[PDB]
Amino acid sequence: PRPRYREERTLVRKLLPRPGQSKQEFRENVKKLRKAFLQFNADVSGVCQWAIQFRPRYGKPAEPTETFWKFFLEPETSLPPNDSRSPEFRRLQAFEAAAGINGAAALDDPAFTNELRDSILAVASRPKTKEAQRLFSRLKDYQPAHRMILAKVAAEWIESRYRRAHQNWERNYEEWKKEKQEWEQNHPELTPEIREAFNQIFQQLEVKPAARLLQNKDNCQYAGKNKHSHTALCKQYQQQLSHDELYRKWRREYWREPRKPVFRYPSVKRHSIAKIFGENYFQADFKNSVVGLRLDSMPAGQYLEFAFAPWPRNYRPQPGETEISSVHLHFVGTRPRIGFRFRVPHKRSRFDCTQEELDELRSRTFPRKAQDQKFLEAARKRLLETFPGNAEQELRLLAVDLGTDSARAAFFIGKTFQQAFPLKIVKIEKLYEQWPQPRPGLSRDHVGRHLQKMRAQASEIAQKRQELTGTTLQPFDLRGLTVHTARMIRDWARLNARQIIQLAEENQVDLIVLESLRGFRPPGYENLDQEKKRRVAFFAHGRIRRKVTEKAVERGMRVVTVPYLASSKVCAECRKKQKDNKQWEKNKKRGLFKCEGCGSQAQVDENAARVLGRVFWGEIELPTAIP
RNA sequence: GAUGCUUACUUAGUCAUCUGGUUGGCAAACCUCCGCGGACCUUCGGGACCAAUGGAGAGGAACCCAGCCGAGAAGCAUCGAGCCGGUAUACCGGCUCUGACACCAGUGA
Ligand SMILES: [Zn+2]
């Protein structure tokens, strides 16, 4: 499909004042960078704002601007492979011609199709909203170098925030349509039309689901429970009766459609972009760490010279090995961390497919939760048919568990489990493999130690803010405490990621089988609820999946993240699926367990390692216990 | 290795009983109300977001900035542990000499 996994691997080094310029002139130079970072993050946010009205509406006939929308985001598909200048330069010309920032009208190039050339004329012949009129008036004075990097980020912003999140939703909606029907005929008990009637009943009392389930599955006894714990919802049930035979089934109908991807513009507050300085717009010295960042208005080769953190000696891509293509300036808090964009190539894997193909299967081809079993069959079959030799005897495979106490990675080659030797994922003065009152390091109790301070310190902010203008926590409320937790929580995902990758480089593994856990929460997580800010201290098991998959493709490997099973209540020798939920929990505390009748006496990590490798093959099937 | 000095430096990669502790704030930065105007989603109740070569106000709890102390970064100096060479057992010269880790910033709870 698309080449999502790029071979860039950008390294970010924080900025310092030069060793002998000043401590105050550095503030007056970063302010010159923040002012230019404010404009770039706002120019991008305006270009993506003007062009978004040309998007397909998913249910309307193809507008003439649709075939230009697909070229703005992905110019590579709509250009010949022998493009003269760049796939990023034709994107600018189409965006230039769509606006009034080019009076030359040089769009008539052989590489531009007539379907596209005649479509931009249908885009320029459109009234602007009096903000794009001044926007492209500002962008008209910009040099072509700025506009090239300006349309690129804006196009890559919608393509990454809306288009991929929307394309993953259309198929999620098309399969929801089939799933909706396949639920109606298969469950025709008391919802031929009553489900619509229940929607009207739910409309009169805006509830917009544990409480709803209790109200629906109630025989007038739940009224006492509702009073103890709601009161308004009881009226709807009484009105419906004037009931329980269809209430328990109408709730599972999920009348609400899957939510559309809410588009957000690049925000300087919470989630921003990084400003790119293209070719001839920066100078980097790596012997002595100084960076020549150049602003937009600098005439002929003057640069603001800063100092950055020294390039690590243990860093694997050395600056002399690969050339730096661009510098990505972003502002975390107030300190301007810049990032270096270089080219580090990938290695050919032992597969004729790509990781992006595996992305396509789960994201859009098999998006639904009940459609997970078919995803594994297609994902497994795709890898085997693209495998050069017999994949049933020489497909090296790893399956990690990624726990907090410990994690073990089983080694599979031909469905024959070799050895689940563990991972040393704990961060103390030395890399241990297990935890020897709060545990010092990357333990759950240490992360929650900031949260209890974060909760205590947030009780003095709302109290003081109430006396100022009133008489919960903004993105800036805990600028230093939260970012440190961010650099700490993601580091636990960075350590786990490389430990997997370093483990997968010792033995020539071709496939990593991760699970689909959401993550683990520190002890101080269930008390700071109702706040988006608490999301920073969530261990984010998906973040490890982010980094493991990104690195595995770099080293020439594929990652398959199976849907979340129990994976630890599943035995490894037999398919028992222990449902005790008490002996397993008690045994998991001490790190071991035992199968009820199978007799396997492995640990929770090795068994999880063995199961996940077995789940990839046809030996173990998913629970699928919805009915 | 231990010790000392200096630095328009760092203390917002993390861990190592660790966003170090503490004192305040002209400028400024940060911040609270409005939005010239746009714009995503929507149960049409709103949610969420960008935003003027633009309007005021205000808190140092928070953010921001600055000072001090502790701490480590480097540049240099002294001695010790270990390696080698020649000259006449010593000396000079050179080297390993200073923690670990990490660095790409589908659905749903
Ligand atoms: Zn068993």
Cα separation of A111 and A90, whole Å?
9
Measured from Cα to the C1' atom, the residue closest to B38 is A131
Cα separation of A52 and A154, whole Å?
10
Using C1' positions and the CA of A207, the closest nucleotide is B43
Interatomic separation, CA of residue A258 and C1' of nucleotide B74, rounded (Å):
57
> How many Å lie between the centroid of ligand 1 and the Cα of residue A572?
6
Q: How far apart are the first and last CA of chain A?
A: 35
Ion ligand 1 neighbours (CB, 5 A) are: A 571, 573-574, 576, 595, 598, 600
Instruction: Give the DSSP letter of residue A160.
Output: I
Q: Supply φ then ψ for residue A512, to 5 degrees.
A: -115, 130
Interatomic separation, CA of residue A97 and C1' of nucleotide B88, rounded (Å):
88
Using C1' positions and the CA of A45, the closest nucleotide is B50
Using C1' positions and the CA of A549, the closest nucleotide is B104
* Residue A250 CB burial class (10 angstroms; 0-12, 13-18, ≥19): buried
Interatomic separation, CA of residue A162 and C1' of nucleotide B94, rounded (Å):
63
> How many Å lie between the centroid of ligand 1 and the Cα of residue A204?
52
Interatomic separation, CA of residue A295 and C1' of nucleotide B8, rounded (Å):
24
**A446 to A194, A324, A450, A494: CA distances (angstroms):** 52, 38, 7, 17
User: Which residue pairs, CB below 8 angstroms and at least 24 apart, start in A314-320?
Assistant: A315/A11, A317/A9, A317/A11, A317/A342, A317/A344, A319/A284, A319/A286, A320/A286
Cα separation of A462 and A262, whole Å?
29
Q: For residues A117 and A108, is the Cβ–Cβ distance under 8 A?
A: yes
A8-20: b (≥16 Cβ within 10 Å) or e: bbbbebebbbbee
> How many Å lie between the centroid of ligand 1 and the Cα of residue A593?
11
Cα separation of A627 and A354, whole Å?
35
**Cα A244–chain centre separation:** 40
Interatomic separation, CA of residue A14 and C1' of nucleotide B79, rounded (Å):
38
Using C1' positions and the CA of A202, the closest nucleotide is B43
Interatomic separation, CA of residue A440 and C1' of nucleotide B17, rounded (Å):
7
Tell me the resolution in Å: 3.1
Among candidate residues A244, A257, A241, A264, the one with its CA nearest the CA of residue A49: A264
Using C1' positions and the CA of A495, the closest nucleotide is B102
Q: For residues A13 and A340, is the Cβ–Cβ distance under 8 A?
A: yes
Provide the experimental method for this PDB entry: cryo-EM
Cα separation of A216 and A218, whole Å?
6
Report angle CA A62, A65, A68 to the nearest 5 degrees.
110
Cα separation of A414 and A97, whole Å?
56
- Give residues with Cβ within 8 angstroms of A502, minimum separation 6: none
> How many Å lie between the centroid of ligand 1 and the Cα of residue A603?
12
> How many Å lie between the centroid of ligand 1 and the Cα of residue A375?
26
> How many Å lie between the centroid of ligand 1 and the Cα of residue A111?
63
Across the strands, what pairs with A339? A12, A328
Other C-beta atoms closer than 10 Å to the C-beta of A225 total 12
Specify the amino acid at residue A85.
Answer: R
Interatomic separation, CA of residue A484 and C1' of nucleotide B11, rounded (Å):
13
Q: How many CA atoms lie within 13 A of A505 on its CB side?
A: 14
Measured from Cα to the C1' atom, the residue closest to B58 is A468
> How many Å lie between the centroid of ligand 1 and the Cα of residue A149?
58
Q: For residues A90 and A155, is the Cβ–Cβ distance under 8 A?
A: no
Domain ranges of chain A: 44-166, 355-616
Interatomic separation, CA of residue A283 and C1' of nucleotide B9, rounded (Å):
22
For every residue of A319-383, DSSP letters joined together read TTTS-EEEEEE--BTTB--EEEEE-------S-SS-HHHHHHIIIIIS-SSTTHHHHHHHHHHHH
> How many Å lie between the centroid of ligand 1 and the Cα of residue A399?
19
Q: For residues A343 and A323, is the Cβ–Cβ distance under 8 A?
A: yes
For every residue of A173-228, DSSP letters joined together read HHHHHHHHHHHHTT--SS-SSHHHHHHHHHHHTT---HHHHHHHS-SSSHHHHHHH
**A620 to A178, A435, A555, A623: CA distances (angstroms):** 27, 32, 29, 9
- At residue A409, the 3 state secondary structure works out as strand
Cα separation of A500 and A552, whole Å?
9
Interatomic separation, CA of residue A32 and C1' of nucleotide B26, rounded (Å):
22
> How many Å lie between the centroid of ligand 1 and the Cα of residue A599?
6
Interatomic separation, CA of residue A308 and C1' of nucleotide B74, rounded (Å):
14
Give strand ranges (E) for A523-601.
558-561
> How many Å lie between the centroid of ligand 1 and the Cα of residue A601?
9
Using C1' positions and the CA of A493, the closest nucleotide is B102
Q: For residues A513 and A397, is the Cβ–Cβ distance under 8 A?
A: yes
> How many Å lie between the centroid of ligand 1 and the Cα of residue A376?
23
**A387 to A125, A354, A390, A395, A415: CA distances (angstroms):** 51, 11, 7, 8, 15
Using C1' positions and the CA of A274, the closest nucleotide is B105
Interatomic separation, CA of residue A374 and C1' of nucleotide B90, rounded (Å):
83
Within 7 Å of a protein beta carbon, the nucleotides of strand B are 7-17, 19, 28-33, 36-45, 47-53, 58-59, 61-67, 99-109
- Give residues with Cβ within 8 angstroms of A134, minimum separation 6: none
